[PDB]
Design a protein around this ligand. Structure first.
Ligand SMILES: CC(=O)N[C@H]1[C@H]([C@H](O)[C@H](O)CO)O[C@@](O[C@@H]2[C@@H](O)[C@H](O)O[C@H](CO)[C@@H]2O)(C(=O)O)C[C@@H]1O
Ligand SMILES: CC(=O)N[C@H]1[C@H]([C@H](O)[C@H](O)CO)O[C@@](O[C@@H]2[C@@H](O)[C@H](O)O[C@H](CO)[C@@H]2O)(C(=O)O)C[C@@H]1O
Ligand SMILES: CC(=O)N[C@H]1[C@H]([C@H](O)[C@H](O)CO)O[C@@](O[C@@H]2[C@@H](O)[C@H](O)O[C@H](CO)[C@@H]2O)(C(=O)O)C[C@@H]1O
Ligand SMILES: CC(=O)N[C@H]1[C@H]([C@H](O)[C@H](O)CO)O[C@@](O[C@@H]2[C@@H](O)[C@H](O)O[C@H](CO)[C@@H]2O)(C(=O)O)C[C@@H]1O
Ligand code: CA
Ligand code: CA
Ligand code: CA
Ligand code: CA
Ligand code: CA
Ligand code: CL
Ligand code: CL
Ligand code: CL
Ligand code: CL
Ligand code: CL
Lengths: 277, 277, 274, 274, 275
């Protein structure tokens, strides 16, 4: 016999330099208030009369979700040569409520005739998330520059046919929840140095949606220089859009269906040369 | 000539500190008793008259399966500073009966006309499993808050339109086999620190199902800190749902079809600082 | 200049290692090469009702199995140890994939009478196993009220429980072309001495997808680094390769199967005598 | 004790390394930003016959190309060695993917007149290239009897041989919006100093699939560890990104393209003088 | 300061032990000669009257392509203990002309009605290539043993229903360009020890084709014992078939469409015990 090591499991608090935050963001499909009958869906998609006359109704346009998480205060003021900042190092993220689509009794269009189940949510899907130290920077680009956007969303200013491609004047920040339409704004790849974003799109009229869920997967947020998003003003920005498809009603009107997203982000305190003038 | 080693194969007992458990869980599609004619399927899916009037018939809603496996007793009592616990380290799992779908003579809707084979099981699929040291923690989220759920399932209490998104009040434990509907409950990603879960969904009205099977794949259950699920009260929780799709009858009525899942979990004895007060 | 090595290629293997090659022809229902429809089932006859569902003989695709006798290792079976063949790897391929690339075979038309004919499509099921004893099977059916014909092995005393997993419904894959695919699947609770791999895609008319290469080897070693051990010096090769169904002009349908090739490497091992 | 601590700060990369960024707008046929259908083709007009197939002006998607002038490296060009920029890696993204998530744009209805409109779908073609000279093209067409419009670069003296690979049908991607996608592909027999990557999915009505992230870098070094070398200090960026077709209510169809962003990292290298 | 190395880039010729060859193989769908109007396509697919009466017209059957490339001569003396052989160690290969399918104006069946684009090439696809030191060895297997094959293709001798499965007598060598039908012959996995082959099939009546192209990808040809194909008689065999799908005419007649394949093969000289 001899003295030797044995590993005992116990509750461990990590070091003071590490923190984790959790949040969820509910979808902003157009009915964005929990009291609304169609919360989590858009209103019925109204289609253009013509190219020139294309005026989506209020609440028919899915928008990005964003939350700003206030992190623990690190500095007394911004006067020193170096400051402390939170660096986001990894994220675990999940789309919540996927199983809710496994439902063929909800009223709608029938799969076959009136004795069958109803058609589930299907068609175009769009799933993206971002984690950054400032708002996600957006680029405007639309299917049609002659669409008239509702007052209650943020559209491209002074739209022209050039906005059917990439016009460098069409820029915005994702700084408001449920206001920036998915069909108008995409992540700006010429910026976003301090954000990590990931997106998947599948189109088609009636395409089957595909989604995974697990609590086993972590995404590392460090860039090619080994540095994660640095949280300006001790704020963490979480952004997403999770359009599962459209639901079709018996009359063939259609509404977009979105799902919430969960985030768990790990951050560490870093010494940073002070960027604030 | 020299003395040297040769490796002889033999029946080896594992260390006393390691055990394996095997179990299977039969599906709970609605007909949940083996004596029922439609065991392994739901009853015919009855669709809503309207948003306001949507009352799924008894036994038409697939539910999660759960089994609690009692493991060998490790402690005389719970009074010491440390205790022994079983830690789940890996799982091999398989969906059983996949080949039963390779059947075009079962009565149903014809692929072409009356001389052809019948349409096989297809449409929405949902496959998930979990292995944990306590019940899987669930989040409620539904397609429609105005559905009336049957008495024999566990539904969200005081359901409101907010339940079409994520409401943090809508929480449950998967603590009853064949009682928690798939379309109401999903894993809660904000909890489940002591469970590992994995899920895959594909929707669509008539989508071909895709399934693999092999006895060559092991999934490691250790988390990011190298710790597997720790079995509270010497109990192992195995959870799953395996909806293969729907079978369509000649009359075009439709029933969900589920399949059983097999689990083989390897566990090891660990010394753990006593969690019980 | 100096003495040094150069690698010369030549024909070469040790007596402790052997390779076996085999092919298994499909057993779709027409299982004898003299049959007109060899490699296909007979026309799929569908159920009148749940209660009345009587598949005609040879309309049910079955698993293939071959038992390969390996070189005899022990003249004496009474020592502390015996020798056994351990299967360590397999190369396997579905043969005849290119035969589906045929739009002139008579059948249902893709468009009208001027177009090509619909190729084999619909449900596919591809699996293989390599083991040192019969593949162990679990019975599970779509409908317990089907009446299976007397030329196939089906579940004994079938009941509604057999639409799920009933632990009494067990069998060994020990007869070529007699165990229906739709009745039997690998039993994951056993098969410690077999490795199996399977892929299924359903749907009424789904396009089949298959690859073929001679570049891929599958290692058969389990989590303890041990391959299947061939009891009585016998190697068991099992498979099913259903490519889809062929549709005739009258809309009757037949299952189409393809052969599978195996190349298994084995090594002699010393094993403690049971 | 004295020890290290890692402080984060802005670092300017070595003088030997530079990054450039650029975007290239799609050239689907309406290639001028003032045009109503900018980012789309004009309505696809189909052949009357094999012999009479004359696509209208601006109905043919063409490749995009941009030449990026890098910092001048060499005062004297008669020296034994020279400096050149070597492209080592690229980050690239298709911009405006989310613009397709739009079911109110006027067109064909998914179901009836109460439903959303069919989104962009059908054939897709996504490719990019990063090189130190123009992308070298091979001509190959579906039909040698098509008459191409004056405003595009077609195969010279086109003959039925051009429905396969004729080594006389070669070009350089040296003009933006002039080389039709359906006439020209990358020439795999050349392009030693370019890296190209392409993905095609066909079909009449196929759902488009596209990913977007800022987390992915592609390494441009070849099997000898060498990236594209920028001749005359010019970097060539090429692409085509056809998202599918939009279908109008009258059933006329137009190609839809999307822009592509490039971020390329380059390093100065000593190169023996050609 | 000090003496040190700097890596200068220059044109380097490989060592004499290594060579690279490039080749392209044009498709052999039935119209196999460049002067033919439908070069790169089959003739219209004529369907069987019945199982017993199934007679595909000449040049309606896509066939494998093959090229035999003569490598540098290695042995003037074939009687020593050893000989030199070229060993194929890697290949870069690409399907050419993928972009030609991105064409909705070619005459044919309409996607919707007469105002829409025309249906592009779709349906069954079959893409394979092989690199070997001798002809690809083939196994015969057909959908129907009662088909009558034309005299301008090599088919199974004395065909019987057994040929709807694997009959070991049904064997051939891919030794003629454009004469061995894809629907009759597949690689023989029981042979081909001196060839590497790779193939992908997707069936279905109207399936969208999927193809990739890049010059960044190399496939290693070394087998499980670390040995690539050895080129007998200093000949390299390149084989392929690349059926992209079918084109449908307005009358609904259908033709197979094939595409060319490019090969770039790297080989090294090896000492080999003289057979
Ligand atoms: C996304 C969703 O819940 N859609 C509902 C739909 C909406 O409530 C409605 O379209 C919003 O205006 O309602 C559906 O049920 C309808 C009944 O509520 C109504 O009394 O009568 C309608 C007759 O066409 C219809 O049955 C629907 O529009 O199909 C059900 C659907 O789930
Ligand atoms: C999943 C399954 O077994 N479905 C059966 C189905 C059910 O047994 C039934 O719908 C539950 O009440 O029955 C099917 O066959 C039917 C006959 O049993 C009945 O005598 O007549 C029906 C006339 O439409 C029908 O043929 C069915 O509904 O198609 C067979 C099916 O596999
Ligand atoms: C798999 C196969 O070869 N199928 C054949 C089919 C078979 O002979 C059998 O019927 C399948 O169960 O026969 C097909 O050809 C038929 C003629 O042989 C017969 O003279 O008349 C039929 C007219 O409806 C038909 O043309 C078929 O049923 O289409 C051809 C098919 O390839
Ligand atoms: C790609 C695109 O934006 N297509 C438009 C289309 C085009 O503006 C036009 O076909 C090309 O010059 O126009 C669509 O709307 C049309 C109206 O502009 C017109 O007043 O009436 C048409 C009646 O059939 C039609 O409604 C179209 O063709 O559907 C809308 C489409 O987004
Ligand atoms: Ca920038
Ligand atoms: Ca939590
Ligand atoms: Ca067991
Ligand atoms: Ca060349
Ligand atoms: Ca052999
Ligand atoms: Cl703007
Ligand atoms: Cl609740
Ligand atoms: Cl039994
Ligand atoms: Cl030319
Ligand atoms: Cl022969």
């Amino acid at each position: 016999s001899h003295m030797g090591g044995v590993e005992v499991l116990e509750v461990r608090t990590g070091p003071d330099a590490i923190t984790q935050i959790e949040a969820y963001l509910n979808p902003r499909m157009g009915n964005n208030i929990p009291s609304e009958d169609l919360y989590g869906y858009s209103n019925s998609i109204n289609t253009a009369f013509s190219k020139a006359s294309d005026t989506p109704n209020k609440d028919t346009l899915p928008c990005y979700s964003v939350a700003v998480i206030k992190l623990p205060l690190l500095n007394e003021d911004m006067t020193c040569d170096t400051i402390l900042m939170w660096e986001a190092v990894s994220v675990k993220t999940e789309v919540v409520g996927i199983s809710s689509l496994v439902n063929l009794h909800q009223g709608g269009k029938y799969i076959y005739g009136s004795s069958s189940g109803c058609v589930p949510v299907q068609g175009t899907t769009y799933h993206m998330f971002a984690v950054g130290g400032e708002p996600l920077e957006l680029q405007g680009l639309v299917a049609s520059s002659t669409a008239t956007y509702p007052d209650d969303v943020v559209a491209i200013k002074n739209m022209k046919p050039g906005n059917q491609g990439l016009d460098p004047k069409a820029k915005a920040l994702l700084d408001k929840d449920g206001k920036y339409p998915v069909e108008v704004w995409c992540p700006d790849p010429s910026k976003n140095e301090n954000t990590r974003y990931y997106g998947s799109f599948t189109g088609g009229a009636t395409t089957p949606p595909v989604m995974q869920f697990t609590n086993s997967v972590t995404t590392v947020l460090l860039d090619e220089n080994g540095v994660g998003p640095l949280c300006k003003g001790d704020k963490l920005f979480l952004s997403c859009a999770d359009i599962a498809g459209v639901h079709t009603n018996y009359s063939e009107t259609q509404v977009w269906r979105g799902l919430p997203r969960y985030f768990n982000v790990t951050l560490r305190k870093r010494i940073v040369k002070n960027p604030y003038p």
